[PDB]
């Protein structure tokens, strides 16, 4: 595969005029994306600590709530177009193919 | 150890200098020293990086000799202040005295501050508990001595944080991704990591006498500390798996950003740092990297508008991280930015300064590279992008961003810095043609009006989903559905009103091209229409700005003598009819129907009316006319009949 | 070896803990009275 020139998949939507240019930017990011005058205020001090509180308190949440070859799995995952899709066809992401995975991986003093 | 009139005295002086030895010791290992501190019970004054459950309970002793003390409790998260109220209150102190007695360890000859957590002064846990002492004695005294020793201590944790970055220079290279490696995870460890770091005695620098001391060894050790997390982090590896828990460590430069913004030197520095981190850590800030850091950026940027030092230096920090990143740090920005876009929070005018400012070139006024361990020509991270942007790049990603995923709570926000951002883009349109009057400049504007004519439209082909229609769960499901459409109204009847009456006038210099076409108008007719369908069960609905801006703002600007749109207008029509027909079959609604927001309906249709008499003839308009009379007569306000009896006028003239 | 090391330091501090213990003690009477005396002087 890294023989191959890299060419990563784009954003494309369809419903759209012909002259809209959509913007070039990968897949990927944008799945992840959507998925997930005076000054005088700001120099006292209260104000300061409130954000510092705030800041803590953020912390404290996060707090509560808490490879090479893979990079390059993901990698050439990612820039090339038909990866781990067998057959060119079958597609990586289809229905059908769960259901293969689930009855063949179905396992059991 | 031993107890010392000046031993904390001795301590500090010694680790003032200690990291200046620390760079001459050749086998020196994190390991080893980790151990042997902990073999020795020491590990704490030498560590930042130690951790060591606190004391459970305190003992304090009152005024007099062999009183009975008392044997207080204390937690992971209580202060001193706390435990000297308790003390108060258990020994029937005065309130007019109480402001002369301060906790003391007699032992140790310590005054102890106010908002200094007791865990961290009594690490260890033993058999015995500390002895305090309630002392009385004038305040100005105590408040000197706590003063000069928290200055004292400031200053050992500046030369613990000196002696940690000393140590980590100076080991070998082949040993120190695994050493960085081991200073990460230590640091996650801490229960108190992220307040050690960032947390300060603001109540001390009011004090004029010694609070500029307190304040430069503040600034200090905030500066340290965040060159000590850039060392760590650029001794990792470059694809190292982060999750929630960076925030811990990025806040930490917030946290300095926030206290002393002001500082030149503390401001050169979190770029230059932010900046390597971004660089170093390629694959997470390109992904979802920059929704830690640009939000407190944003937020100082805004807030200290008068302070051009600073604002230039953010501009330039932005200019780097778009060189960088490009379009995804614009579009991490814009999700940044929305929650706290007000339309105490980034004004649309600030959010469009920032803009103009990375439109064009920023000069280096601090040296801010001089400090970035990278290629000084920071060439684009990702080989896919030598370009500069406008608005109206910016415009066509968030179109694109809301026509991916139209139902999801990142298209409402998109929607929102559109609507925030078009008005200022109209605007300086506006002013480039009126200080410069030269033919060009008409020319570059009606191509700009063109260019956001067209993006407008692909935004209303791709957002048809909204046309569908339809305690706490049914407000949040209301308020989703309505806001997006809310903002869509908005921007077109904004970007409609604005531009339309302009192309006559620009046009009178040296044509006219159809701003929305057709279809764009039956779509934002249809979704005026659902969101009517709901208006009358909802009074927010009723209430809305942008549903009453487009019934009475835009029908009558919109010219429906063209038969291919007037079904457009048919749909609201017939909607109204329909809705007010409702409104009179069953008293139920009428009890608590709202009609000052309905008058806004009937006086936006009346004003159609008025501004083209075309629309009179179309047969749907006289039933509404009919039921409306009817619904008058039990008895509607005054600001509906009014608008009923004109419309009527209007229908009679026409 | 670090465990026969650990278990050799520590059965020999179990060994002083006993001196320890005695000389408590005696130490503890000897102060719990004298804080009787002070208690009396209250």
Redesign the interface.
């Known amino acids: 595969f890294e023989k191959f020139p890299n060419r990563?998949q784009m954003?494309k939507?369809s419903?759209?005029?012909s002259?809209?240019?959509?913007?070039?930017?990968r897949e990927?990011?944008?799945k992840?994306?959507?998925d997930?005058?005076?000054?005088i205020?700001?120099?006292n001090?209260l104000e300061?600590?409130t954000?510092?509180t705030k800041?803590?308190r953020?912390?404290t949440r996060?707090?509560m709530?808490?490879?090479?070859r893979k990079?390059q799995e993901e990698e050439l995952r990612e820039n090339h177009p038909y990866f781990d899709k067998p057959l060119f066809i079958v597609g990586r992401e289809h229905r059908f193919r769960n259901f293969c995975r689930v009855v063949v991986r179905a396992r059991f003093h | 150890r031993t107890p010392c009139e000046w031993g904390m005295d001795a301590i500090s002086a010694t680790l003032t200098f200690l990291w200046e030895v620390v760079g001459y010791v050749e086998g020196l290992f994190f390991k080893d020293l980790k151990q042997t501190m902990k073999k020795e019970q020491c590990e704490v004054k030498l560590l930042v990086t130690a951790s060591m459950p606190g004391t459970k309970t305190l003992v304090v002793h009152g005024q007099n000799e062999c009183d009975i003390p008392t044997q207080l409790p204390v937690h992971e998260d209580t202060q001193f202040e706390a435990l000297l109220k308790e003390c108060l209150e258990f020994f029937n102190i005065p309130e007019s005295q109480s402001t002369h007695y301060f906790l003391m360890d007699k032992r140790w000859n310590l005054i102890h501050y106010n908002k200094t957590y007791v865990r961290d002064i009594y690490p260890f846990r033993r058999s015995v508990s500390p002895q305090l002492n309630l002392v009385h004695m004038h305040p100005e005294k105590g408040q000197e001595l706590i003063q000069k020793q928290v200055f004292t201590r400031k200053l050992e944790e500046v030369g613990r944080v000196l002696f940690l970055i000393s140590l980590t220079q100076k080991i070998p290279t082949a040993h120190k991704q695994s050493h960085v490696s081991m200073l990460q995870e230590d640091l996650l460890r801490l229960?108190s990591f992220?307040?050690s770091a960032?947390?300060?005695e603001?109540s001390l620098?009011?004090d004029p006498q010694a609070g500029k001391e307190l304040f430069g060894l503040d600034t200090l050790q905030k500066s340290l500390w965040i060159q000590l997390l850039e060392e760590m982090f650029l001794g990792m590896?470059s694809?190292f798996?982060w999750?929630?828990?960076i925030?811990?460590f990025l806040?930490v430069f917030?946290?300095a950003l926030?206290?002393h913004?002001?500082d030149s030197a503390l401001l050169r520095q979190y770029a230059a740092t932010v900046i390597n981190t971004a660089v170093h850590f390629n694959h997470l800030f390109?992904?979802?990297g920059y929704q830690w850091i640009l939000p407190t950026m944003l937020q100082?940027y805004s807030?200290?508008?008068?302070?051009p030092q600073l604002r230039q230096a953010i501009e330039f920090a932005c200019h780097q991280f778009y060189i960088l990143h490009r379009?995804?740090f614009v579009?991490q920005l814009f999700?940044s930015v929305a929650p706290l876009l007000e339309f105490k929070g980034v004004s649309a005018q600030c959010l469009f300064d920032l803009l103009q400012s990375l439109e064009g070139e920023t000069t280096d006024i601090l040296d801010i590279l001089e400090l970035v361990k990278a290629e000084k020509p920071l060439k684009s991270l990702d080989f896919?992008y030598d370009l500069t942007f406008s608005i109206s790049?910016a415009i066509?990603?968030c179109?694109?961003?809301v026509?991916?995923?139209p139902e999801?709570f990142?298209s409402l926000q998109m929607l929102m810095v559109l609507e925030a951002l078009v008005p200022c883009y109209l605007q300086k349109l506006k002013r480039q043609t009126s200080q410069v009057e030269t033919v060009p400049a008409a020319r570059e504007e009606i191509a700009a009006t063109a260019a956001l004519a067209?993006?407008l439209?692909?935004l209303l082909?791709?957002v048809?989903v909204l046309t569908r229609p339809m305690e706490l769960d049914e407000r949040i499901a209301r308020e989703e559905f309505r806001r997006p459409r809310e903002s869509l109204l908005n921007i077109c009847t904004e970007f409609y009103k604005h531009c339309g009456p302009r192309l006559k006038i620009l046009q009178n210099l040296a044509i006219a091209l159809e701003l929305l076409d057709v279809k764009s108008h039956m779509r934002l007719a249809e979704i005026a229409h659902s969101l009517l369908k709901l208006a009358p069960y909802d009074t927010q609905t009723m209430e809305s700005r942008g549903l009453r801006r487009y019934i009475m703002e835009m029908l009558p600007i919109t010219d429906w003598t063209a038969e291919a749109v007037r079904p457009a207008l048919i749909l609201i029509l017939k909607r109204l009819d329909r809705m007010f027909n409702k409104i009179h079959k069953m008293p139920t609604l009428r009890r608590q129907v709202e009609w000052e927001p309905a008058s806004n309906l009937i006086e936006g249709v009346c004003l159609t009316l008025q501004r083209q008499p075309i629309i009179s003839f179309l047969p749907h308009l006289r039933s509404l006319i009919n039921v409306c009379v009817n619904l008058v007569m039990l008895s509607p306000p005054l600001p509906f009949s009014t608008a009923v009896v004109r419309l009527v006028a209007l229908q009679i003239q026409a | 070896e670090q465990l026969e090391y650990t278990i050799e330091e520590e059965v020999a501090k179990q060994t002083i803990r006993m001196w320890l213990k005695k000389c408590l003690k005696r130490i503890r009477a000897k102060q719990q009275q004298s804080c009787s005396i002070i208690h009396s002087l209250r």
Not at chain 1, 65 to 68: R, T, Y
Not at chain 2, 303 to 307: C, G, K, L, T, V
């Open positions: 990563p954003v939507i419903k759209l005029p002259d809209f240019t959509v913007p070039k930017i990927s990011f944008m992840q994306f959507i997930r005058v005076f000054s205020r700001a120099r001090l300061k600590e954000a510092v800041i803590l953020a912390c996060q707090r709530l808490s490879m090479k990079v | 229960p992220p307040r960032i947390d300060a603001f620098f009011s590896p694809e798996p999750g929630d828990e925030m811990l806040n917030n946290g926030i206290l913004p002001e390109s992904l979802s100082v807030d200290y508008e008068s302070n379009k995804p579009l999700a896919c790049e066509k990603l179109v694109t961003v026509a991916y995923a999801s990142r067209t993006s439209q692909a082909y791709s048809e």
